[PDB]
Amino acid sequence: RKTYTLTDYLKNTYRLKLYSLRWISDHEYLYKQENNILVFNAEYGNSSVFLENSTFDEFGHSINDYSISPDGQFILLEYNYVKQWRHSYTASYDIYDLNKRQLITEERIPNNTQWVTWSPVGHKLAYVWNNDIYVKIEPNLPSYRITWTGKEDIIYNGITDWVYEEEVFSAYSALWWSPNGTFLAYAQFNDTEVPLIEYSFYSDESLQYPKTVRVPYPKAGAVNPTVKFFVVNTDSLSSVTNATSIQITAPASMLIGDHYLCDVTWATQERISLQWLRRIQNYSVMDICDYDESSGRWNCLVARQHIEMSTTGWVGRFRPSEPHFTLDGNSFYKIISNEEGYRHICYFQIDKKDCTFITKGTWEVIGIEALTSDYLYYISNEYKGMPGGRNLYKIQLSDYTKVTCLSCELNPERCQYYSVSFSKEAKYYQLRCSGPGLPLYTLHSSVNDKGLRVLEDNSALDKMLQNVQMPSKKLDFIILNETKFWYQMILPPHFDKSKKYPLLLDVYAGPCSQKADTVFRLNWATYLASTENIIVASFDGRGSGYQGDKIMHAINRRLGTFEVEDQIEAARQFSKMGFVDNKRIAIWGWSYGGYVTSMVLGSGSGVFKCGIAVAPVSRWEYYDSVYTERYMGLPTPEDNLDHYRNSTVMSRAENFKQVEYLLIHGTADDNVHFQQSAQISKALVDVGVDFQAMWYTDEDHGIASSTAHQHIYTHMSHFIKQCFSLP
Amino acid sequence: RKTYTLTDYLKNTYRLKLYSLRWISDHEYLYKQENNILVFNAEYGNSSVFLENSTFDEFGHSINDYSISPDGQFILLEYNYVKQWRHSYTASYDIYDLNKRQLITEERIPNNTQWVTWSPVGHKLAYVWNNDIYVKIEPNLPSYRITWTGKEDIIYNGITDWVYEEEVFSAYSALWWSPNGTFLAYAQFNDTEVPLIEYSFYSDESLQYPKTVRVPYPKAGAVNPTVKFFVVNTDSLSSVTNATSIQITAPASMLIGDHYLCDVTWATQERISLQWLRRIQNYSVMDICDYDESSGRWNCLVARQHIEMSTTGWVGRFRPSEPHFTLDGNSFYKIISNEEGYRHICYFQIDKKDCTFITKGTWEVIGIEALTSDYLYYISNEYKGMPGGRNLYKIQLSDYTKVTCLSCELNPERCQYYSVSFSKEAKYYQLRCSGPGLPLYTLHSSVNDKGLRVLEDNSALDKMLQNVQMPSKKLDFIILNETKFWYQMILPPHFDKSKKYPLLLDVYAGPCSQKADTVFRLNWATYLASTENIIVASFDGRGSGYQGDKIMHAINRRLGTFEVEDQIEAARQFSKMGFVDNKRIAIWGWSYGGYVTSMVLGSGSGVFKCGIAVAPVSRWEYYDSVYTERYMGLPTPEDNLDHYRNSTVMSRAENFKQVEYLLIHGTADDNVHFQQSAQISKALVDVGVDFQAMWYTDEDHGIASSTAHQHIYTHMSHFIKQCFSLP
Ligand SMILES: *[C@@H]1O[C@H](CO)[C@@H](O[C@@H]2O[C@H](CO)[C@@H](O)[C@H](O)[C@H]2NC(C)=O)[C@H](O)[C@H]1NC(C)=O
Ligand SMILES: *[C@@H]1O[C@H](CO)[C@@H](O[C@@H]2O[C@H](CO)[C@@H](O)[C@H](O)[C@H]2NC(C)=O)[C@H](O)[C@H]1NC(C)=O
Ligand SMILES: Cc1ccc(-c2c(CN)c(CC(C)C)nc(C)c2C(=O)O)cc1
Ligand SMILES: Cc1ccc(-c2c(CN)c(CC(C)C)nc(C)c2C(=O)O)cc1
Ligand SMILES: *[C@@H]1O[C@H](CO)[C@@H](O)[C@H](O)[C@H]1NC(C)=O
Numbered sequence A, B: 001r002k003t004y005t006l007t008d009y010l011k012n013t014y015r016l017k018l019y020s021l022r023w024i025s026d027h028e029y030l031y032k033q034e035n036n037i038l039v040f041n042a043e044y045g046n047s048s049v050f051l052e053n054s055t056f057d058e059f060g061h062s063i064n065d066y067s068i069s070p071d072g073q074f075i076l077l078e079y080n081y082v083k084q085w086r087h088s089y090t091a092s093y094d095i096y097d098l099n100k101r102q103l104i105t106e107e108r109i110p111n112n113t114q115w116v117t118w119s120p121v122g123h124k125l126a127y128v129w130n131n132d133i134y135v136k137i138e139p140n141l142p143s144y145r146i147t148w149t150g151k152e153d154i155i156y157n158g159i160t161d162w163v164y165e166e167e168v169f170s171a172y173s174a175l176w177w178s179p180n181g182t183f184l185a186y187a188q189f190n191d192t193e194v195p196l197i198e199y200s201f202y203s204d205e206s207l208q209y210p211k212t213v214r215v216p217y218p219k220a221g222a223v224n225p226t227v228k229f230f231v232v233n234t235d236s237l238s239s240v241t242n243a244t245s246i247q248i249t250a251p252a253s254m255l256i257g258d259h260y261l262c263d264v265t266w267a268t269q270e271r272i273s274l275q276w277l278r279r280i281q282n283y284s285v286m287d288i289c290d291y292d293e294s295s296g297r298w299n300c301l302v303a304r305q306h307i308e309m310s311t312t313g314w315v316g317r318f319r320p321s322e323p324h325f326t327l328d329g330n331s332f333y334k335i336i337s338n339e340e341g342y343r344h345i346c347y348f349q350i351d352k353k354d355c356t357f358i359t360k361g362t363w364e365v366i367g368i369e370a371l372t373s374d375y376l377y378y379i380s381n382e383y384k385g386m387p388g389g390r391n392l393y394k395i396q397l398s399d400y401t402k403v404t405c406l407s408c409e410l411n412p413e414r415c416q417y418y419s420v421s422f423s424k425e426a427k428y429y430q431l432r433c434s435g436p437g438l439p440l441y442t443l444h445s446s447v448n449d450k451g452l453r454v455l456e457d458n459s460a461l462d463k464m465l466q467n468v469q470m471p472s473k474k475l476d477f478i479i480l481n482e483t484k485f486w487y488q489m490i491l492p493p494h495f496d497k498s499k500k501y502p503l504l505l506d507v508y509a510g511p512c513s514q515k516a517d518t519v520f521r522l523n524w525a526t527y528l529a530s531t532e533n534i535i536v537a538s539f540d541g542r543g544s545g546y547q548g549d550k551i552m553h554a555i556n557r558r559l560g561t562f563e564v565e566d567q568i569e570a571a572r573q574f575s576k577m578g579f580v581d582n583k584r585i586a587i588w589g590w591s592y593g594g595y596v597t598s599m600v601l602g603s604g605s606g607v608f609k610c611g612i613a614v615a616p617v618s619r620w621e622y623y624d625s626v627y628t629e630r631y632m633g634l635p636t637p638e639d640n641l642d643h644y645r646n647s648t649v650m651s652r653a654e655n656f657k658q659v660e661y662l663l664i665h666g667t668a669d670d671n672v673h674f675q676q677s678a679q680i681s682k683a684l685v686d687v688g689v690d691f692q693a694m695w696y697t698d699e700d701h702g703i704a705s706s707t708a709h710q711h712i713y714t715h716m717s718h719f720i721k722q723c724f725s726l727p
């Protein structure tokens, strides 16, 4: 009879089995068994082996990822993985012919390649190297040289810079092929005047002098990257003339000032859609641009432009959403907030100024997952009115009121969080279920939506978790000015409502965040509840997502206000329930959570004994322009400087005398710079408040190193245990 | 009923009075009584007015410092002080005609000036601005520019670079006037190929992007600054034809490569002495150079050369000793290591190389303080064979056996640590007594060694310390391996040795250090004994100074060995004394003391429960060449690399699992770089040992900001109380 220990969490004793497959046709997907990678047939299942691992063991180098070509002829191996930022990395690449049975040696892909992608059909390659774009019409051929202007830290061709990577595209890649892989669309970013963030990287103890890393990084109000857009034709590449890309200029109302490229989506072989966002991110335009054969140019007609804007806030959850065109390319679906401020699927005609909505209600559509000619498939939180649940729906295109829930009723107790993966023409789908019970992976046919087999139900984990004393998750709401607000609690085993438990408040609370859901987790909180008998709770107040614009846009231009006040009020609500020890309530968070934590601790509320802030923001002038300005506008006297000034944690320094505070930050944090914490510490020293700090040499925003990760949770555990007088 | 508290220490409740005087001649001096400046006399006794704050009230700026021309016709005012390194700073200056107290309005000295000085007689002015040397013959006349090669962070004319400032000269100036003010000697430094240490500077929270500070700084082994030495004739300075500076080169045996200028000392109006130290600091040379009148040149004869070398260690305490010259210039005295390790005064004939010792015995002369044609005055630790005492000895130059202690018998019980300040021809002298009693300042006639008067006796401070329960101070020795090793103890008031006290070991242990002496102090240790009833102890083990080369050279090429061992053995010996709590012994230290504390905590000896390291060295390769190499040699396969690698705190990480460790470091430490501590924390993370940490944003090696100084000492108090379970 024993608990889920810290060493359990940290060491990964109770492992969570996944089921990762890559569709490659309408009928088949690839998946790993004994490392020997196989292929399954969705119809019956004569799942014969595809690529035995007695192939690449004494190939010479460590395999990291691979990529099968669409036509199925060439596996693209990947080694020398060297991570950059959250998405970016560099690596070495070699190709392996299946039909010739061997690996290619001439016209090899350079070391230090920045990104690689196959065409969507066939086997063409496109790769970025040294900031320039290259294309290989055949793997064994010499590449064609698409761009000549790439320059380390200044001109990026076909890859994003820091801020486009982290904030706009969530990808290092910036190449998009057309469907039949004829045209290659790419973006080029210019960082010329984007000031640099500089910081030290101490490296191995063998490095005598520290290295100063320098990254183009626009802090709020700074000069932003500019952006241009190009399309080249890959079927007519010459070796005796430089291939000439065609520029598609942003629409007029974008060129009038600073703007971003926020979406690229091909609709047909000869039609592409670009979405642009103004720097003041409440106005955005979609351009449909058609290819003209008799000139070789692209034409975005004025009348095909669609405008999406917001008077209450910004546009989209984080950016405008992506269109989903019909086969013929004359219409699209995309999620937009309606008149009521709730996000729903709207159906657009290229020619018309106005769309008709095909979903509605006090819930939101999370995403469009597949569009056939008979049915639209989407994910929502409609079921049981739980904004923290996810389910698969299909809309009958011939009568959109006829909607079906595919996943709702499959396993009601076990499963209320779902995501889907469709076959190439959506004839089959894999259903992934992430809680409340053990995760569950299942396969299904689109014909009857009949369940075919269980892929992975984590019975392995179940069978050995039975004799661990597990905490229960409770998920509920409280009320506030006639509005529902949701929370979750990880409750210790044998929870007794007549005992006063100490309480940790797990906060993130950034705009569109959601901490109160039905996902099952084995994390630090599990340890605190299982081992230490600490109620760890999380709460979604104002600014939180997936419940409508009224709640989401409540912190518009006013960060460090309602989302902070609301965490404090949540605590008062939790004391008022009488199973909480008033004398032992704490708060912690990472990233935006670190900022809210810090603001709550400096609030003078008196509700919180102590807290921990990991890589927090300290004032918004220190964070990147694209995120920050979305919610804060510009930091100038003409826009929002006053509130930038009023929302710093530094200005609350004196009130840290009222709490025990632990501040942790990594030194190699490229994202929220160590600066932010340096300024916190300095302000606390200046008003004479005592507190604890911990820096993590060379660690980044996730402090993800194995040893660093273990060290930090061990440090926070000790701090909380001593904060709560735990033995 | 009350004790000396942490606030008493931080807010300076009980101040030590000083009698800081400066001699203007051989009869009179100055003193800051009130804050108005007064002239004083010792001749007939009287003392009149001279200056005040309202002489320079409507001035505007607050005066940081002043300086009278030797003749007393001019006063130089120092304001706009901006500190740089340990001695270097920049400032703005104004000159008054001290006769008329009116400012010299035109041809003013430039802002941002890096050093300024009067000639030894008359009123000549030499200053350095933008790394170039300037001379003002009459304060209202235009300057003459001496050098034209000054370039920031690259060529330094008349001022030191980082390492010459910290380690060689302990000064910013590299300018030296001749006794009558005709010649201005100076040094030029070239840091062209010297690598930069780089680190972030965060500044006020207004600074959106942190600043990167770049300092030329040779770590152990790196390329060093080169040097040149010049003299220029400040009388024949024209106005139409650039000044020509005569170069005195280093002797041959130095130019074989990599050497330093470590002493510059004039002998007459036309004779100057230079001392050069090979980069391997066990071989030094002295060159004596005569000005050739029918040439304008300086000639240094090979016969006149003398050589200071050491077969068992380096030469000097931290540098070759300075020479004091008899009036004719044909004779000089300088302290060197005698035949059997002890440091004593040697008498030199300029022409021949066989010197002869005027003192001997198992004690050391600390410094030669005054020279007349009659006697020679010096300070030493002979009295009662106490390494940690200082007294003033006078030796008869005609008969070396007839020596007299001028300070020994004055106040035996109160006063065992003297320093002296002579008048410009040694007819009068001040005695500073720094302990063991309350400091006492007394003026004497040297002509008959009669005590004239008590200047300051600290009877004010004596008065209030009777209302306070003050700690006692024990100074004694222990015999280890038939050798006397000295220690000091700060013992709680009402100390009773049938109790078991917790004991903090206060450590520095650096080469030639002394933490065991007769000096009275009011510091953190005073509070710990007085209030927290903690014994604070220090111990001078192998490597400490002022007890003979045997003891001091004991760790040559062997940092992190015997000085680490001996601190551990000190604790054992203290616990074996029977009034220490074995379960509660802590260790702490700053800078080199930080390094030792850490090595001791890493040693696995099990004696220490916990410890604090502040700005420690973590491995010797990171620290500056001049200091490190002297003790370690080069970190190369053919010299002493093995020991460099054997003596890092990183390698001892595993052993910190036995102790509570607090590691503190300022992020703007130009001296001991944050790196060193970043490598400590990373090592400890990587083996998985928990520890406390604290950075100080923008503090240097001193962590000397008012607020930070308060913050750190408060933080360290909490750590020690808690480690000791003090309530
Ligand atoms: C990247 O953008 C910069 C502007 O920030 C461009 O640099 C300018 O180039 C024009 C050429 O007409 C010059 O007149 C300017 O002097 C340049 N400005 C600066 C500040 O350098 C540059 O054209 C862009 N680079 C590319 C290849 O698109
Ligand atoms: C400082 O020293 C550097 C060498 O470390 C000197 O630089 C050289 O100067 C010569 C003569 O002008 C050049 O031809 C070399 O190419 C330079 N080498 C390097 C590495 O820069 C410099 O001249 C010195 N300055 C002074 C005033 O002494
Ligand atoms: C101050 C701060 C710092 C980081 C983030 C963040 C962002 C945005 N940079 C994004 C990209 C979004 C597109 C999801 N992801 C994550 C996981 C995080 C996060 O680690 O929380 C948000 C705020
Ligand atoms: C690792 C380290 C760091 C600094 C020092 C130091 C030195 C030498 N740089 C000197 C210059 C000497 C002439 C005394 N002074 C002092 C006060 C200190 C010190 O702060 O203790 C010695 C070792
Ligand atoms: C890449 O690196 C490997 C090993 O360093 C080398 O053999 C290969 O030729 C390189 N390829 C290219 C094209 O740079």
Ligand SMILES: *[C@@H]1O[C@H](CO)[C@@H](O)[C@H](O)[C@H]1NC(C)=O
Residues within 6 Å of the ligand: A148, A240, A241, A242
């Ligand atoms: C393509 O353009 C680059 C840069 O303008 C030029 O140097 C090169 O000659 C061109 N390539 C060929 C082979 O035509």
Ligand SMILES: *[C@@H]1O[C@H](CO)[C@@H](O)[C@H](O)[C@H]1NC(C)=O
Residues within 6 Å of the ligand: B092, B108, B109, B110, B111
């Ligand atoms: C020093 O600088 C200030 C401010 O720029 C200026 O007004 C003053 O005249 C300067 N003084 C000298 C000595 O040049």
Ligand SMILES: *[C@@H]1O[C@H](CO)[C@@H](O)[C@H](O)[C@H]1NC(C)=O
Residues within 6 Å of the ligand: B148, B240, B241, B242
């Ligand atoms: C002195 O020499 C410098 C630098 O070599 C030169 O620029 C200048 O012309 C000379 N100055 C005068 C005042 O003659």
